[PDB]
Amino acid sequence: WYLFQYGYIPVIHELAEMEDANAVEKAIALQIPFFMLENSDHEVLRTGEST
Amino acid sequence: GSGVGISTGGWVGGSYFTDSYVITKNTRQFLVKIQNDHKYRTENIIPSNAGGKSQRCVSTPWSYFNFNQYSSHFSPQDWQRLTNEYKRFKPRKMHVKIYNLQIKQILSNGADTTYNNDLTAGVHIFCDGEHAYPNATHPWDEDVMPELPYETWYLFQYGYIPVIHELAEMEDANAVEKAIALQIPFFMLENSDHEVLRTGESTEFTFDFDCEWINNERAYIPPGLMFNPKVPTRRAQYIRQHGNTASSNTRIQPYAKPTSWMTGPGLLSAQRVGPAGSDTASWMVVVNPDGTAVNSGMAGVGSGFDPPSGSLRPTDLEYKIQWYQTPEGTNSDGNIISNPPLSMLRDQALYRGNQTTYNLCSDVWMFPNQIWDRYPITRENPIWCKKPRSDKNTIIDPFDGTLAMDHPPGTIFIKMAKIPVPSNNNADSYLNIYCTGQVSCEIVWEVERYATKNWRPERRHTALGLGIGGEENINPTYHVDKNGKYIQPTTWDMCYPIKTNINKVL
Amino acid sequence: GSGVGISTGGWVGGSYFTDSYVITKNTRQFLVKIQNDHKYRTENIIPSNAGGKSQRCVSTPWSYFNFNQYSSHFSPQDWQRLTNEYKRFKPRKMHVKIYNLQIKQILSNGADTTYNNDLTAGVHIFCDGEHAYPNATHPWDEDVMPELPYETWYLFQYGYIPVIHELAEMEDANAVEKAIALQIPFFMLENSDHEVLRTGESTEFTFDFDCEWINNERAYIPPGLMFNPKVPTRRAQYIRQHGNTASSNTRIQPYAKPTSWMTGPGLLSAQRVGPAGSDTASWMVVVNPDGTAVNSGMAGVGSGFDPPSGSLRPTDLEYKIQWYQTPEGTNSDGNIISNPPLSMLRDQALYRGNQTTYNLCSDVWMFPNQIWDRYPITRENPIWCKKPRSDKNTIIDPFDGTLAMDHPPGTIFIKMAKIPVPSNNNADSYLNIYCTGQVSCEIVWEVERYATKNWRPERRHTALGLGIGGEENINPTYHVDKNGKYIQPTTWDMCYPIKTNINKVL
């Protein structure tokens, strides 16, 4: 079983393309969330550990 | 102890925030005056330009307190702190006191008028907790407790609509018109047991809420957009032959993954009709059972339904909720027009492939696997509405954002005790009196704080979004000018709506 | 149990907010490499264009952890929530773990290099809690823990300045130059008892803070402006005769009431000097006891003091604090320049009446009845500084906003154990190794929530103040672009400073 890389869609792209000047396009873009999984407490294992 | 020269309470005010709950305390000075000549009347309201719309009302001597509004309970400071710091809130408990009452006699000689108190006079206070009477309050009306705690609250006269008027007009001879009319109910509030107070007495009322939460969190993507764009999909799609382009069967693209979820319902087809004096709505809900002649247009029979759009994008300003911030507001001056919160659940649309392009389908009825958000509510929205008692109903989400309740807070009715005076020839001559007093409303609000794993900053409500107005145009919004007038928000964002600041992961 | 194939800890991360306290958890991956050829050296740092400024450093084999920064402990989400919801915070307890260590050997054949672990190798970890050694860390340096939790943290080599160099240059014959030189201290970290770890061992360190609060509240008026403008005053004023205008004695106006309070101190007189390569500061603090020849300009003898302004309004950009947001920032590109918070305690000035107009007096020394605010601090500021041990000092408020401490968090020093290899002719040939591991820092922060009686909304930090940049210029601030690069705030407001949002009544 080969793992697949994790990824997510943060914003609808066409809304935030912010071509030229648009006030609401600018606002949607500044609100784009960003998630790192390192902010969580998780576990690190070596070859003798299991979970 | 207690007596004439002893106060029955004191002023409460402010707001107390904790992580679990919020308590808002509000006191107002109110004025009760004699309404409707101490008598019940049933009058026809028939304006000239309404295009056939006419109603009959039963006007009473009674007046009532209306607490349904956010601006009344929360200050702009308290509201900001609520919508910034909490992802959920609902009203829990509500306690009302009426105290420090003063009944005075009005002696009108002429241009001059004098005011003398009468200690033996009294005031009737009735609270209807079982909802045995027609509901006094309706959302968006102007009768609510004032926003500024030092402003005086003038009661509004109680009245109700006993029958659809056009049905019971009973012009010429009709059998069903006659039958509907003989069944018209008539409600007096004196059939109830209520309380009479003098100037040293006070009263208290408690109310519990059975409610659904108001949700302050925002959706950053549509529910149909949640997938990993990298991972390929097993699904295949078939494109029928159209033009010279031959048919094809192929695997769906990894970025194109189809959603299992659907647009919330709403009706965009209709347009408003006729003169403004008439009832003007794109959609008109009528009750016209049988029998009774059609007579005028459906405006007289019907009620009318807006906002029709629900979660769908309003095409134009006819479909958007808008109100006036002050009772003096007229003709597109001082009106606040709702805007999109920029939540992805809040605005939605459906398009229908014709094999060439997509076309917006206007009527989205209720359908399985639909998701949407309730209307984002500001301080200027009413809190709750009365849910009509019936056998069957669909999902209940009033499009005005209110919380429908089986038993909202019971209306408190209040009336000046009629003091008759003798008369040589028999007439109704009451003594002319009025009462002013203090009413305090304490609501306990259940709240929940947010915790997010988002890295980036989130939107918040800032005083930097506010505007500046006044006579000298130097004062900011939610402040007072040099005449004492209170600067009202000009735009919908200055009202600090919910479903904006706090993100959620769908 | 414990062993080679067992991990000694796990990743901790995040932030936990309560009304009483906040806990920030951070874990990083760090890299230790052999520094300075395992030897102490004392070198002269003498750049060509510095205009006589030259220093001598003692370089060591050791490296150290530097936790002093806000960006390292708080995310932009956590920082926003802190500065919006709390009026006070201070660091309370700090716990550091070093674990999951991996020592590897570097086999350099050529263009290719291979890496093999050696389980018997070890790493020295020394924490100095008594501050018996020259402090490793200095505010605003680039060596701090990374902001992004997935970025690798490269240790920086430890070194210290043993003597002012120009004093001890001891050119020709001087008696006091000879004496200063013979007293030069020399510190080795091996005189201490410290710990040696192998790949299965871990270590822990606790630190307590004795601190003063950081205050997040804002002042809406100056302290001299607090009075009732209506009430008249008893005070009289005397205006000496000037021109044809005769003298007068008169009562002070009710709106003009004089303050009993004074502008905070600051020095605006001086200007920066000379080429950028030199140490350039408006004010230069020198120690030149006696004896030693003047030689070059004072730049070599002195340290230099900025920001000089303190609470006073910076006249120009020379007096403003500015830094670079990335180490690649050069030449007014990527530099953030401090701005006024619009707090009335923060910016101040004094003017001196000459009988005609007022003139700004540049040097405001410390004077009784002065009030000011500390510098408003962002995430990009260091948290604390080392307070030098001395007999006497004045009020301690570093103009960089840091918290001066008698005993800051002790520096943790770390070094690769020297593994010697045999040699036929006697030379120093060490085995070439390096260690990577995981360090977790947990700080407990004591906080206090605000309660205000203000009616109106207050300013908050919003993501709507952020900018948009990147390669494609589509990504917002505090996000990553398509190359993995992290978008940095362009302006000082995007850094969310304190002393802005929350009002206080002076």
PDB file of N, CA and C in Angstrom, chain C residues 473-505:
ATOM      1  N   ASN C 473       1.629  36.435  -6.851  1.00  0.00           N
ATOM      2  CA  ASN C 473       0.998  37.578  -6.195  1.00  0.00           C
ATOM      3  C   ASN C 473      -0.468  37.287  -5.877  1.00  0.00           C
ATOM      4  N   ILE C 474      -0.820  36.005  -5.797  1.00  0.00           N
ATOM      5  CA  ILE C 474      -2.161  35.606  -5.406  1.00  0.00           C
ATOM      6  C   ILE C 474      -2.269  35.192  -3.942  1.00  0.00           C
ATOM      7  N   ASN C 475      -1.175  34.979  -3.260  1.00  0.00           N
ATOM      8  CA  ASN C 475      -1.305  34.486  -1.901  1.00  0.00           C
ATOM      9  C   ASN C 475      -1.276  35.620  -0.885  1.00  0.00           C
ATOM     10  N   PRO C 476      -1.997  35.478   0.215  1.00  0.00           N
ATOM     11  CA  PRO C 476      -1.993  36.510   1.247  1.00  0.00           C
ATOM     12  C   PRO C 476      -0.802  36.366   2.189  1.00  0.00           C
ATOM     13  N   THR C 477      -0.693  37.329   3.095  1.00  0.00           N
ATOM     14  CA  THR C 477       0.391  37.334   4.061  1.00  0.00           C
ATOM     15  C   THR C 477       0.218  36.189   5.046  1.00  0.00           C
ATOM     16  N   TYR C 478       1.344  35.677   5.536  1.00  0.00           N
ATOM     17  CA  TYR C 478       1.430  34.548   6.447  1.00  0.00           C
ATOM     18  C   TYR C 478       0.951  33.264   5.809  1.00  0.00           C
ATOM     19  N   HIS C 479       1.158  33.116   4.522  1.00  0.00           N
ATOM     20  CA  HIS C 479       0.823  31.920   3.785  1.00  0.00           C
ATOM     21  C   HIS C 479       2.057  31.530   2.976  1.00  0.00           C
ATOM     22  N   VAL C 480       1.976  30.433   2.240  1.00  0.00           N
ATOM     23  CA  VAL C 480       3.099  29.952   1.449  1.00  0.00           C
ATOM     24  C   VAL C 480       2.767  30.099  -0.026  1.00  0.00           C
ATOM     25  N   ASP C 481       3.786  30.367  -0.837  1.00  0.00           N
ATOM     26  CA  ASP C 481       3.598  30.460  -2.274  1.00  0.00           C
ATOM     27  C   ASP C 481       3.879  29.107  -2.924  1.00  0.00           C
ATOM     28  N   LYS C 482       3.947  29.085  -4.255  1.00  0.00           N
ATOM     29  CA  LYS C 482       4.072  27.817  -4.963  1.00  0.00           C
ATOM     30  C   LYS C 482       5.481  27.260  -4.870  1.00  0.00           C
ATOM     31  N   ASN C 483       6.432  28.072  -4.438  1.00  0.00           N
ATOM     32  CA  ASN C 483       7.793  27.600  -4.262  1.00  0.00           C
ATOM     33  C   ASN C 483       8.073  27.160  -2.837  1.00  0.00           C
ATOM     34  N   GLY C 484       7.077  27.206  -1.963  1.00  0.00           N
ATOM     35  CA  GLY C 484       7.272  26.925  -0.565  1.00  0.00           C
ATOM     36  C   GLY C 484       7.653  28.124   0.261  1.00  0.00           C
ATOM     37  N   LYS C 485       7.902  29.265  -0.372  1.00  0.00           N
ATOM     38  CA  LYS C 485       8.312  30.452   0.354  1.00  0.00           C
ATOM     39  C   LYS C 485       7.126  31.061   1.088  1.00  0.00           C
ATOM     40  N   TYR C 486       7.403  31.560   2.281  1.00  0.00           N
ATOM     41  CA  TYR C 486       6.396  32.020   3.222  1.00  0.00           C
ATOM     42  C   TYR C 486       6.258  33.529   3.119  1.00  0.00           C
ATOM     43  N   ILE C 487       5.046  34.001   2.828  1.00  0.00           N
ATOM     44  CA  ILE C 487       4.848  35.426   2.598  1.00  0.00           C
ATOM     45  C   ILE C 487       4.896  36.163   3.923  1.00  0.00           C
ATOM     46  N   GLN C 488       5.792  37.092   4.025  1.00  0.00           N
ATOM     47  CA  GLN C 488       6.116  37.949   5.145  1.00  0.00           C
ATOM     48  C   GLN C 488       5.295  39.225   5.097  1.00  0.00           C
ATOM     49  N   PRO C 489       4.965  39.794   6.253  1.00  0.00           N
ATOM     50  CA  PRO C 489       4.233  41.067   6.274  1.00  0.00           C
ATOM     51  C   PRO C 489       5.078  42.204   5.726  1.00  0.00           C
ATOM     52  N   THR C 490       4.468  43.023   4.871  1.00  0.00           N
ATOM     53  CA  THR C 490       5.194  44.139   4.274  1.00  0.00           C
ATOM     54  C   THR C 490       5.212  45.364   5.177  1.00  0.00           C
ATOM     55  N   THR C 491       4.174  45.563   5.979  1.00  0.00           N
ATOM     56  CA  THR C 491       4.050  46.779   6.761  1.00  0.00           C
ATOM     57  C   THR C 491       3.973  46.452   8.242  1.00  0.00           C
ATOM     58  N   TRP C 492       4.164  47.498   9.044  1.00  0.00           N
ATOM     59  CA  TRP C 492       4.253  47.342  10.488  1.00  0.00           C
ATOM     60  C   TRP C 492       2.908  46.978  11.095  1.00  0.00           C
ATOM     61  N   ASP C 493       1.817  47.403  10.466  1.00  0.00           N
ATOM     62  CA  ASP C 493       0.502  47.048  10.975  1.00  0.00           C
ATOM     63  C   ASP C 493       0.165  45.587  10.740  1.00  0.00           C
ATOM     64  N   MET C 494       0.686  44.987   9.674  1.00  0.00           N
ATOM     65  CA  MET C 494       0.472  43.573   9.422  1.00  0.00           C
ATOM     66  C   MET C 494       1.128  42.690  10.468  1.00  0.00           C
ATOM     67  N   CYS C 495       1.989  43.251  11.300  1.00  0.00           N
ATOM     68  CA  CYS C 495       2.650  42.526  12.369  1.00  0.00           C
ATOM     69  C   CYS C 495       1.841  42.517  13.654  1.00  0.00           C
ATOM     70  N   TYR C 496       0.685  43.169  13.658  1.00  0.00           N
ATOM     71  CA  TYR C 496      -0.220  43.210  14.800  1.00  0.00           C
ATOM     72  C   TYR C 496       0.456  43.671  16.091  1.00  0.00           C
ATOM     73  N   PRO C 497       0.772  44.957  16.209  1.00  0.00           N
ATOM     74  CA  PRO C 497       1.336  45.467  17.457  1.00  0.00           C
ATOM     75  C   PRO C 497       0.303  45.578  18.560  1.00  0.00           C
ATOM     76  N   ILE C 498       0.792  45.735  19.788  1.00  0.00           N
ATOM     77  CA  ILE C 498      -0.080  45.905  20.940  1.00  0.00           C
ATOM     78  C   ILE C 498      -0.329  47.386  21.185  1.00  0.00           C
ATOM     79  N   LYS C 499      -1.024  47.700  22.282  1.00  0.00           N
ATOM     80  CA  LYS C 499      -1.325  49.078  22.682  1.00  0.00           C
ATOM     81  C   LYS C 499      -2.131  49.805  21.611  1.00  0.00           C
ATOM     82  N   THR C 500      -3.011  49.069  20.952  1.00  0.00           N
ATOM     83  CA  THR C 500      -3.829  49.555  19.851  1.00  0.00           C
ATOM     84  C   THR C 500      -5.305  49.273  20.072  1.00  0.00           C
ATOM     85  N   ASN C 501      -5.664  48.013  20.281  1.00  0.00           N
ATOM     86  CA  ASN C 501      -7.063  47.621  20.265  1.00  0.00           C
ATOM     87  C   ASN C 501      -7.818  48.124  21.488  1.00  0.00           C
ATOM     88  N   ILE C 502      -7.335  47.805  22.682  1.00  0.00           N
ATOM     89  CA  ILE C 502      -8.136  47.852  23.899  1.00  0.00           C
ATOM     90  C   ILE C 502      -7.956  49.203  24.570  1.00  0.00           C
ATOM     91  N   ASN C 503      -9.057  49.916  24.769  1.00  0.00           N
ATOM     92  CA  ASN C 503      -9.015  51.207  25.436  1.00  0.00           C
ATOM     93  C   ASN C 503      -8.910  51.050  26.944  1.00  0.00           C
ATOM     94  N   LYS C 504      -8.323  52.058  27.580  1.00  0.00           N
ATOM     95  CA  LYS C 504      -8.319  52.184  29.026  1.00  0.00           C
ATOM     96  C   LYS C 504      -8.728  53.600  29.394  1.00  0.00           C
ATOM     97  N   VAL C 505      -9.352  53.736  30.555  1.00  0.00           N
ATOM     98  CA  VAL C 505      -9.652  55.039  31.125  1.00  0.00           C
ATOM     99  C   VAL C 505      -8.513  55.401  32.062  1.00  0.00           C
TER     100      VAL C 505
END
